[PDB]
Amino acid sequence: KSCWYEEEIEENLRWCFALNSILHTGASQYQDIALLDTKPFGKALVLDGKLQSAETDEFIYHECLVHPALLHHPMPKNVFIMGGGEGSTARELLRHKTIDKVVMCDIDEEVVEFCKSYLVVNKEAFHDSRLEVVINDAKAELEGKEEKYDVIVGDLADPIEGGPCYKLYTKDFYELTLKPKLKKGGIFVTQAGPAGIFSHTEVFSCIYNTLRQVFKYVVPYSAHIPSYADIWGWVLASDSPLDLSAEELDIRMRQRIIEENRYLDGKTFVSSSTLSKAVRNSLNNETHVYTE
Amino acid sequence: KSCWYEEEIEENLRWCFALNSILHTGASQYQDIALLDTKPFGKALVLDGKLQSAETDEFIYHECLVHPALLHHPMPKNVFIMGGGEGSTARELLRHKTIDKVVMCDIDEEVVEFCKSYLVVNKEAFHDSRLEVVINDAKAELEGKEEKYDVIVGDLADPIEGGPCYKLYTKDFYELTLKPKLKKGGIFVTQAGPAGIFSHTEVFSCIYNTLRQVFKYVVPYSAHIPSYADIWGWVLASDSPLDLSAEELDIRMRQRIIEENRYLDGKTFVSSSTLSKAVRNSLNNETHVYTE
Amino acid sequence: KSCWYEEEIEENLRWCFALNSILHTGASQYQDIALLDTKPFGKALVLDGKLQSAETDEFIYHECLVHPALLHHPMPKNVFIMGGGEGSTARELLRHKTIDKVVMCDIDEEVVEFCKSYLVVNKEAFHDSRLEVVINDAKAELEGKEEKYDVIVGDLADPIEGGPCYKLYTKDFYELTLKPKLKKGGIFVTQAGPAGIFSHTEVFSCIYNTLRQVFKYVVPYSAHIPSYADIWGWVLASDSPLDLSAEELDIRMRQRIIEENRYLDGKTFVSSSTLSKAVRNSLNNETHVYTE
Amino acid sequence: KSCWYEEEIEENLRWCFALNSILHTGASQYQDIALLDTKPFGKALVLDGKLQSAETDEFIYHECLVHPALLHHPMPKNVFIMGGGEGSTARELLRHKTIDKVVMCDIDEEVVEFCKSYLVVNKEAFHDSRLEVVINDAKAELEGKEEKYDVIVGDLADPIEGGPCYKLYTKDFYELTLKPKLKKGGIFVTQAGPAGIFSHTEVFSCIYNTLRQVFKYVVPYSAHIPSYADIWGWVLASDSPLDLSAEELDIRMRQRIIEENRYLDGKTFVSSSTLSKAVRNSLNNETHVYTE
Numbered sequence A, B, C, D: 001k002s003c004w005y006e007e008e009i010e011e012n013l014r015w016c017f018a019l020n021s022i023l024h025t026g027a028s029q030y031q032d033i034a035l036l037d038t039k040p041f042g043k044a045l046v047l048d049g050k051l052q053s054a055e056t057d058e059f060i061y062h063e064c065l066v067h068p069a070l071l072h073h074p075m076p077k078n079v080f081i082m083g084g085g086e087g088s089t090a091r092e093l094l095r096h097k098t099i100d101k102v103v104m105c106d107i108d109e110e111v112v113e114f115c116k117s118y119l120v121v122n123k124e125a126f127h128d129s130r131l132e133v134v135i136n137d138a139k140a141e142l143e144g145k146e147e148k149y150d151v152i153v154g155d156l157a158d159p160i161e162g163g164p165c166y167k168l169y170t171k172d173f174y175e176l177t178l179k180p181k182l183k184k185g186g187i188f189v190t191q192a193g194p195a196g197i198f199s200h201t202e203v204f205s206c207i208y209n210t211l212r213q214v215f216k217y218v219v220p221y222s223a224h225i226p227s228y229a230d231i232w233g234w235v236l237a238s239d240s241p242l243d244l245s246a247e248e249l250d251i252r253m254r255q256r257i258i259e260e261n262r263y264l265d266g267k268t269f270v271s272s273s274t275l276s277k278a279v280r281n282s283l284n285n286e287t288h289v290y291t292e
């Protein structure tokens, strides 16, 4: 095949996908933006040269990010997303019947406009009256406003030094900006980077341990995302408990979410939060904490 | 970082590993045989241009291939391996104290002799008095010998038309050749190809469904193998039940297996054997059966 | 710099060009047709996954293909092009004031229509009253029409077994079909494939030797084409001598050709027609003759 | 094919060769050193990630670099090489019957040792009593010693800012270090980088113009080197004339060089020094000069 997008995932690992076209290439002051039409994963959003969403498997990422957090809440009504410009986290949140307000707070208007325009899947979401789009740094936005939320969702890029996301994974940020803005019984969830057998030590274990230092209950979980070329991680965090069985998750899904989930049922969530021996022990032994 | 090993996982997806060296390249009349020293995965055995074992994570594959089968057996004493010339399957079998004899039946003497010399991790295994190496087609060997086994392990390449491995995945094979050479309570396990969200439809679902036509109890399961760049699958099959808890499995590990498993504990197996919603249902609805 | 067009020049040599866009991809039943906007070479026409014309250097190929033949002719008035659907060969022919008619005979109407729409450099050429476009196999066309030409231009793909172009490079073709349709003093020129130090043995030496069996005077010549990643070759053939000095050629350029050539002057042609020691001798000693 | 060496030749152009092995990888304080066994070009020396010599076509580079300069001299006896660690420039120089002394002055002992050991072709050269190996910066070595030479050969890497070679292409270096150390009737030749239709403006035109400002007679010439993925350039420079015909070159070769040249005869040299229209005009119009 002639045409390829190439991504260096580590300094010694490259991942190449065959291309149909290069649909749109924008840029803002924040990052490079690109929509590719790829053979293996369909349409793909690439930010600063990292694939961040692919048409074929974004559903897995977005179901996993969103649904566990809301299903463990007794009655989630309002939710604040840090990031979300791609719009699929909002789509999945808006599937919940209890939800009356979703704030998408992304720093990059152009990403939003771009995806608002070209990720057709998210059109019903982007137009729902419950969605409020806010163009800001989520950290500034959070400390600015007094509104408190049932659920806060971190749908940011991994914490990389000198980037616009690193701040929002520090113990400082959690303790003093995020957690004050959680209602009673509030639940936080953040995307947490690679969660492979070896790749999980880069950011996942540290995000987990950083949250461990702020919240009473912390639940790491993971699932394969083919377009990310790895197992990916999320962490639920709360000062209230987080224990539903699979059966109780399935009941809650059937009652509270419109239409059928495609990836996530209760058993899948139970498998997801049962990390492997080595990962589970690695996380437990982690002592690094993100800080100022 | 300018020398790379490349593998086309699909016709539109390439995975590239930075190389330190090319330790050996060659061929038997069956297959090309190469050993690469890679940066991300250490020494990697590449057979017909497909990476089959990487030093850093082969433990995952071989622990998943071997331990669930033997652990589910009350008392496995004799095992036959279809393929296994690389030696790691034998290695993990020989960690079981209950085992008295392992037959490794590989068609290609050069794989065996090459791995016996170059894959040092398996040196003790290859030299264990309990191991018998037979150089033959596994199907011809099983047909021509009356010996029966407590466990038979399929460590062959994926089934396709016309390759030397296809006929060892058929309904007629399992029924007429393999099952008669299982002892009372015998367990079969085979590797079963990619088991990703979409890639599982190639062979994993068909192997599962084929086995489902021959054995009463069939347990498919899967785990990520980074050097294979996908979730990989295995299938257990038996005419006796295959239902142990994570705790039962741990006790058995502790009683029967020399040293600590690096990948697999009881929980990890339960997680591996709980497939995602989509994969589970796809397997259940599969109707392809491999036949002669 | 993460999207790339790749071409395997040989089974062990790849050339990759950074892409701006994929402007079109598709196919007729003859060939795939793609137009890529490349960084190093501008818009590149790719036919069956082989780059055939790049905006930045196609002038070299087409100047070398066309001008030496016409310049050596006392008075070329009518020309037939075998292939030429891309339009650049016609373009450079039509710069000659002496020309009254060009027949462009391409087998693939979709190449013609595509290039006529998308390769703007050739718009005037395509619209010139002197140009006739015929959609046919060039061999069938020449056989079935009595018209004779002062020059015939071979602008076909390289000869191999079974492709649509092979039979237009054979001894029997040149003798029985082409030569009878040359006027008195007629000159044949064909593109002749790679002409590198080693790559010239594939087809360039064989075309030269084949022509040497049919025509009295045969002048092979070559020039670097960066976007082809090699030296490329052409062969002039005639029953009348082909021996002009660099100065004679310049005077003719000045008298007959509208505008300045960007690549070819008289000296450049003399240089191109002086092959290296090794290539010269290899051509002289070649004995393969293409036959039906 | 599985294993590749990748070279970025421009920011938008990559060149990939299939690999047999990575024979040796050294490093010194000056550069990275590597010997690859490549499929398309055989054994290849790579310095700081740039291929600098390949077994299959180094003869072209080294014949072109060496023989024109000596053949234009009436009686060259002693020669100083700036660089030469690879040893092939010395090999070709030592083929001349008039030559009694060759100084190989390379800054990197390890390159020399490495090639002394592993480039078998140059064994007779490296052991010839006329060869003096000197481990130094050629600029310091030149200004240090009083010996004057009939021919000085620049076999350095292209002039790249902040590298150890840039100094040795400045007008200052030429005027005040190099030219004082040329005997009466002395001839200088330097390798001069890419000499393609467009690539020649990077260093070739500037090296040419810089020498033009120091020497009375300057002759640029070029030839394709497949392993360099380009036409490559050299420049002869002298205060005496440089005009032999092809015929006079061939006589001189037959009388003065042992054995047959494989690439270069008199006609080849004449073709080589007949640049194309555009290159010839580009060089003539160059006004940039390398300086302090």
Ligand SMILES: NCCCSC[C@H]1O[C@@H](n2cnc3c(N)ncnc32)[C@H](O)[C@@H]1O
Binding pocket: A030, A047, A052, A082, A083, A084, A085, A086, A105, A106, A107, A108, A111, A136, A137, A138, A139, A155, A156, A157, A164, A165, A168, A191
């Ligand atoms: N794994 C999937 C991750 C998705 S890509 C990261 C997303 O979060 C936004 N973003 C980056 N920094 C941000 C900040 N400080 N505040 C709000 N949004 C931000 C960015 O514009 C982009 O939409």
Ligand SMILES: NCCCSC[C@H]1O[C@@H](n2cnc3c(N)ncnc32)[C@H](O)[C@@H]1O
Binding pocket: B030, B047, B052, B082, B083, B084, B085, B086, B105, B106, B107, B108, B111, B136, B137, B138, B139, B155, B156, B157, B158, B164, B165, B168, B191
């Ligand atoms: N990922 C797990 C695959 C590892 S590679 C496939 C292995 O099975 C052998 N093999 C192939 N066909 C065979 C046959 N009919 N009988 C015995 N061994 C065979 C082959 O020689 C090789 O060692």
Ligand SMILES: NCCCSC[C@H]1O[C@@H](n2cnc3c(N)ncnc32)[C@H](O)[C@@H]1O
Binding pocket: C030, C047, C052, C082, C083, C084, C085, C086, C105, C106, C107, C108, C111, C136, C137, C138, C139, C155, C156, C157, C158, C164, C165, C168, C191
């Ligand atoms: N580098 C110079 C090659 C350019 S690409 C080859 C061109 O010759 C046409 N073509 C192929 N076979 C043909 C035939 N038998 N008759 C007429 N045109 C033909 C084909 O449609 C295409 O336009």
Ligand SMILES: NCCCSC[C@H]1O[C@@H](n2cnc3c(N)ncnc32)[C@H](O)[C@@H]1O
Binding pocket: D030, D047, D052, D082, D083, D084, D085, D086, D105, D106, D107, D108, D111, D136, D137, D138, D139, D155, D156, D157, D164, D165, D168, D191
């Ligand atoms: N196109 C083919 C070029 C060959 S590669 C450049 C060669 O010139 C040496 N070299 C680099 N800088 C040098 C200096 N200042 N003095 C002497 N040798 C040097 C370097 O160690 C190497 O052997």
